[PDB]
Amino acid sequence: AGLPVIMCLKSNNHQKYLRYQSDNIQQYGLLQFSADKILDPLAQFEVEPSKTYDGLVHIKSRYTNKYLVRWSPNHYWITASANEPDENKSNWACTLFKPLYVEEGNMKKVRLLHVQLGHYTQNYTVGGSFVSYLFAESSQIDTGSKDVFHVIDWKSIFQFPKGYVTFKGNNGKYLGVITINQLPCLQFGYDNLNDPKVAHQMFVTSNGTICIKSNYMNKFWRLSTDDWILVDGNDPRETNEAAALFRSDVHDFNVISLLNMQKTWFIKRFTSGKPGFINCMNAATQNVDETAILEIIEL
Amino acid sequence: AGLPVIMCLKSNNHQKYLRYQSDNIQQYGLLQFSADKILDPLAQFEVEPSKTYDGLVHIKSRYTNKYLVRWSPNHYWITASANEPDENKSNWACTLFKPLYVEEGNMKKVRLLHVQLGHYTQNYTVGGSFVSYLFAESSQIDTGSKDVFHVIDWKSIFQFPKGYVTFKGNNGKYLGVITINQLPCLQFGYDNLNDPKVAHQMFVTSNGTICIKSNYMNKFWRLSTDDWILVDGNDPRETNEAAALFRSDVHDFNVISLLNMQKTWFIKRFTSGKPGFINCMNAATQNVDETAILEIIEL
Ligand SMILES: CC(=O)N[C@H]1[C@@H](OCc2ccccc2)O[C@H](CO)[C@H](O)[C@@H]1O[C@@H]1O[C@H](CO)[C@H](O)[C@H](O)[C@H]1O
Numbered sequence: 253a254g255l256p257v258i259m260c261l262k263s264n265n266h267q268k269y270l271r272y273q274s275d276n277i278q279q280y281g282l283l284q285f286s287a288d289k290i291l292d293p294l295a296q297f298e299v300e301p302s303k304t305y306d307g308l309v310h311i312k313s314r315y316t317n318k319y320l321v322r323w324s325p326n327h328y329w330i331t332a333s334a335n336e337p338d339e340n341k342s343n344w345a346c347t348l349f350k351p352l353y354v355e356e357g358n359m360k361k362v363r364l365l366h367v368q369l370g371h372y373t374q375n376y377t378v379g380g381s382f383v384s385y386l387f388a389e390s391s392q393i394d395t396g397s398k399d400v401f402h403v404i405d406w407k408s409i410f411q412f413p414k415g416y417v418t419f420k421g422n423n424g425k426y427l428g429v430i431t432i433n434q435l436p437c438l439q440f441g442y443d444n445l446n447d448p449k450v451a452h453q454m455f456v457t458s459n460g461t462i463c464i465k466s467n468y469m470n471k472f473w474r475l476s477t478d479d480w481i482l483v484d485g486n487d488p489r490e491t492n493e494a495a496a497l498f499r500s501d502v503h504d505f506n507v508i509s510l511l512n513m514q515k516t517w518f519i520k521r522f523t524s525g526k527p528g529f530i531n532c533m534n535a536a537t538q539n540v541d542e543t544a545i546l547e548i549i550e551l
Numbered sequence: 552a553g554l555p556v557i558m559c560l561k562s563n564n565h566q567k568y569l570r571y572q573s574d575n576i577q578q579y580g581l582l583q584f585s586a587d588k589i590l591d592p593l594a595q596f597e598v599e600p601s602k603t604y605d606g607l608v609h610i611k612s613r614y615t616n617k618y619l620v621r622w623s624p625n626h627y628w629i630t631a632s633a634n635e636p637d638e639n640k641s642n643w644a645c646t647l648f649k650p651l652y653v654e655e656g657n658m659k660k661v662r663l664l665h666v667q668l669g670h671y672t673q674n675y676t677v678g679g680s681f682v683s684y685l686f687a688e689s690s691q692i693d694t695g696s697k698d699v700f701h702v703i704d705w706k707s708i709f710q711f712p713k714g715y716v717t718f719k720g721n722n723g724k725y726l727g728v729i730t731i732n733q734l735p736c737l738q739f740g741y742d743n744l745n746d747p748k749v750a751h752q753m754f755v756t757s758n759g760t761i762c763i764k765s766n767y768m769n770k771f772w773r774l775s776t777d778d779w780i781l782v783d784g785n786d787p788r789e790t791n792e793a794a795a796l797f798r799s800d801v802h803d804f805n806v807i808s809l810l811n812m813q814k815t816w817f818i819k820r821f822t823s824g825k826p827g828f829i830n831c832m833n834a835a836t837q838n839v840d841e842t843a844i845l846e847i848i849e850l
């Protein structure tokens with residue numbers, strides 16, 4: 253029903269992601285808006301269309317793989333614990349929900365309606381222990397907007413924008429081609445997003461590796477001399493040269509670290525000491541460090 | 552190919568479960584046998600049978616939802632990062648694996664063969680930081696059995712024994728029916744498993760709640776007088792009475808805690824001080840405590 257197959261839900265009320273409560277407490281199994289990162293492995297939910305009613309959806313925790321349902325015949329609290337879907341709208345354990353979009357056209361802002369109850373769900377707090385749990389309150393839209401959620405496609409976190417992009421390093425500069433000592437280097441030394449030497453294109457392959465092409469040079473990034481990433485490579489989708497293949501480590505939307513597949517070390521802003529090699533891309537760190545975090549800027 | 556749709560892999564070698572490496576380290580994305588508990592949200596994998604090759608399978612991390620594939624054309628290390636499966640047996644990024652059962656008929660002990668390489672995968676260590684990672688070493692069986700794994704069906708940890716069972720309290724005693732003041736109580740005070748009063752039957756419903764029946768009395772457990780759990784209930788599957796419905800918090804195989812759905816507190820071995828009610832089951836703890844830990848012994 254317009255929702256992502258695997259999704260994450262964020263609450264504007266306090267900017268946290270919905271996650272399965274796994275602590276051994278009274279609230280075990282309930283859903284709390286407490287995941288700080290979208291990467292939290294308890295924050296994924298899979299949506300499944302209703303067999304019978306078009307527009308209605310079933311939702312299960314990816315972790316437990318069990319459906320969202322009312323805690324008991326007497327509760328409005330939602331638990332990701334049903335072994336199977338129930339489409340009988342009259343049953344208190346009916347698992348059907350109805351996504352209702354807040355602003356027409358926008359699929360990333362929704363309200364989730366528990367079908368059987370006809371109540372909207374909210375990031376609800378009662379007292380002391382029941383803080384920020386998913387609760388099907390009533391048929392009235394909330395005044396504090398605690399029933400509005402931001403939908404996020406889990407899949408998209410591991411996707412990159414193909415089209416010209418540049419990378420912004422931790423010194424505030426943009427990554428551009430630069431010839432140094434007859435070597436076609438990449439340097440975090442540009443201040444302008446319009447200098448065309450700053451443009452690159454990312455190709456993500458089916459196996460997961462990524463190859464990047466400098467627009468200016470029309471050549472691919474490739475680990476080479478002294479582990480500098482140089483812009484001289486041929487298309488590795490054809491050559492299968494590990495030196496021109498990268499695997500990303502996503503920190504958040506458009507914030508990543510890339511591991512070069514030849515050295516299996518992370519690329520980062522580096523200044524070797526040798527004259528001219530200042531703030532140039534080098535596979536110089538085994539584990540992620542501050543200089544290894546790249547922010548992707550779409551052009 | 553005989554494997555469960557969602558599974559966890561345990562290393563025969565050092566008894567840890569296979570899990571996705573999420574740290575921002577060189578090994579990010581690789582699979583390490585470091586999960587101490589099956590409940591680790593990074594230890595579940597899903598199996599997809601091959602489209603063209605009978606007996607072959609593709610495997611993905613439930614978390615990333617990406618397929619296990621070689622790290623690069625030059626590595627035998629396995630990473631859960633392929634975007635899609637690849638059935639081309641010649642390509643280095645081929646995602647096919649062949650499960651080989653160690654003991655004929657036993658679908659639980661297996662060796663996983665990387666089809667493209669023709670190599671068995673092992674809980675492999677190279678030193679330093681490449682400790683205990685899945686590596687398709689060679690076509691030779693390993694003398695240390697680091698290539699033999701125990702397959703656990705993820706869905707089976709939320710399931711309980713059919714037929715008779717009893718519950719062992721933390722005081723080392725079994726739970727049996729006992730009449731105290733005409734109130735048919737459940738007490739942790741028996742040592743005989745063949746005592747008929749110690750026999751119970753668990754029923755898991757499609758919505759996740761459980762109802763438990765004493766066989767001796769032939770009545771269901773039910774929260775009643777003074778939050779004591781008495782054996783006087785009618786089938787809550789017909790009554791829908793929250794007082795006779797429980798939801799489990801699974802700690803490990805046959806080690807659970809039961810929350811009563813009426814009080815929404817866990818049941819535990821309890822002695823109120825009120826003369827006579829010693830070590831009887833009472834919904835007396837908000838969060839799990841040691842007395843609330845029950846061990847299911849199947850009769
Ligand atoms: C209907 C429901 O889930 N009520 C639960 C809620 O109560 C506040 C409320 C707000 C808005 C609309 C209706 C109700 O939260 C309470 C938190 O302690 C409580 O869970 C309550 O549910 C009752 O819990 C009782 C046990 O503590 C008992 O089981 C009652 O039968 C429940 O309705």
Ligand SMILES: CC(=O)N[C@H]1[C@@H](OCc2ccccc2)O[C@H](CO)[C@H](O)[C@@H]1O[C@@H]1O[C@H](CO)[C@H](O)[C@H](O)[C@H]1O
Binds near residue numbers: 625688
């Ligand atoms: C083939 C392979 O994955 N080799 C990797 C392995 O080497 C030990 C080994 C044991 C048994 C059979 C073959 C090899 O572990 C190494 C750990 O540091 C390393 O990952 C090695 O892979 C090489 O790594 C190189 C850089 O680290 C380079 O990328 C080579 O192309 C790789 O083969």
